Amino acid sequence: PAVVHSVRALMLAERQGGSFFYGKIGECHYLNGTERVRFLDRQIYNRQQFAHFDSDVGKFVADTPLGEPQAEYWNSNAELLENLMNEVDRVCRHNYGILESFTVQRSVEPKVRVSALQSGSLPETDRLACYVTGFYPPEIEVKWFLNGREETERVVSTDVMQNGDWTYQVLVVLETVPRRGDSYVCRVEHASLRQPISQAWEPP
Amino acid sequence: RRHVLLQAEFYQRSEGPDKAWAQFGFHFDADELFHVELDAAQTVWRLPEFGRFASFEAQGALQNMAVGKQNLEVMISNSNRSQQDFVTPELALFPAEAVSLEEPNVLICYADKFWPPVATMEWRRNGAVVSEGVYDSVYYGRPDLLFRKFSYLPFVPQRGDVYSCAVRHWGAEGPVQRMWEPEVPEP
Numbered sequence A: 001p002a003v004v005h006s007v008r009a010l011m012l013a014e015r016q017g018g019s020f021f022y023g024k025i026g027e028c029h030y031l032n033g034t035e036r037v038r039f040l041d042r043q044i045y046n047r048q049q050f051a052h053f054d055s056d057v058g059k060f061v062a063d064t065p066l067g068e069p070q071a072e073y074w075n076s077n078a079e080l081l082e083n084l085m086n087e088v089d090r091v092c093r094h095n096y097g098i099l100e101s102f103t104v105q106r107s108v109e110p111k112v113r114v115s116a117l118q119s120g121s122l123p124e125t126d127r128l129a130c131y132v133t134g135f136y137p138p139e140i141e142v143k144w145f146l147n148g149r150e151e152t153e154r155v156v157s158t159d160v161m162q163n164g165d166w167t168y169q170v171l172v173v174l175e176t177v178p179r180r181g182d183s184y185v186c187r188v189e190h191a192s193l194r195q196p197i198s199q200a201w202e203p204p
Numbered sequence B: 001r002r003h004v005l006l007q008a009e010f011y012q013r014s015e016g017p018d019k020a021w022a023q024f025g026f027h028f029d030a031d032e033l034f035h036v037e038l039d040a041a042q043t044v045w046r047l048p049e050f051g052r053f054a055s056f057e058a059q060g061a062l063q064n065m066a067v068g069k070q071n072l073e074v075m076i077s078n079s080n081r082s083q084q085d086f087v088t089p090e091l092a093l094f095p096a097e098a099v100s101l102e103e104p105n106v107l108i109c110y111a112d113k114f115w116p117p118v119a120t121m122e123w124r125r126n127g128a129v130v131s132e133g134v135y136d137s138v139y140y141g142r143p144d145l146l147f148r149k150f151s152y153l154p155f156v157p158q159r160g161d162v163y164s165c166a167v168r169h170w171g172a173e174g175p176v177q178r179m180w181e182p183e184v185p186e187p
């Protein structure tokens, strides 16, 4: 293996029922990978971010009055500000190179299944469901074609859902009563795929 | 395209019932690379295989915990102990895969858009609590400084079985609940 690097807690907050929450979020924003990298350190108390450090600004910015005393003190220490700026190479650049292979370049193919759903008011199929499952990255295109024509009006789609296991899913339903001699095709385009998946539905 | 790698830390305590929590995790966009089990001082990759490709020194998490728990007591003070409105979780429940009877599957329950990050999920089948195979996630950072948490129930779809997921958030005297049941048409 290779060692992932953590942002150290160099800054310390300075003194100036009930629930009490403190959060630290060190964001390594990548645009065009290593070409442009931005480090944002977010300091949160309860649900209010009192201050943040932007690598582009190179100084701490107070987002709330409570953050003003903290930002001034941290900005006084030039070695801290330099050390935080070094985290763009030390954490953001370092970590990108180790994790790009199985993150930035994760590809998992959609599995595609079409099934008929019954009406619930009538003895018939009223919906055709295209279950698109197990895919990464999250961005996907799913389209219904009836006799070669794209349908938009009679298709209702769920959001793309996070499964939480690094896979995603989406359900695109075509509202139609299937007719024998009609072609119903679910077409799926995804980065993992050289050729789109055209999953046709046939009756019994 | 643009990507984000997050080091997310939270340190929290409640006084009405006295309790305390802490978390250290690395997140790639909306998914979790790993969390450090702070009591065991052990790095836990969300997918085992991630562990073969990289490693993390858990000592770095615990060093940050020392400062987190201090910063927490400072800001409790600096804020004259000010309180934030809780935010009750929404609940999503859906299977991982379209359901075929007798084909092993997983029911996925996530609690979303909640704060503070304290919530427990209870699974029931036909009214009775089930815990076998369940995986409970750590708290995933969501837009607006809110959190999401996932629970997974392995199950074998069978006729007559009704499933439920319930979330108890720290604040509330009441659970948020959702039901799910296989829909099997007639030929």
Ligand SMILES: *[C@H]1O[C@H](CO)[C@@H](O)[C@H](O)[C@H]1NC(C)=O
Binding pocket: B078, B079, B080
């Ligand atoms: C707390 O807030 C200010 C300082 O933050 C303090 O002067 C004051 O005594 C407290 N506010 C109240 C209880 O009015």
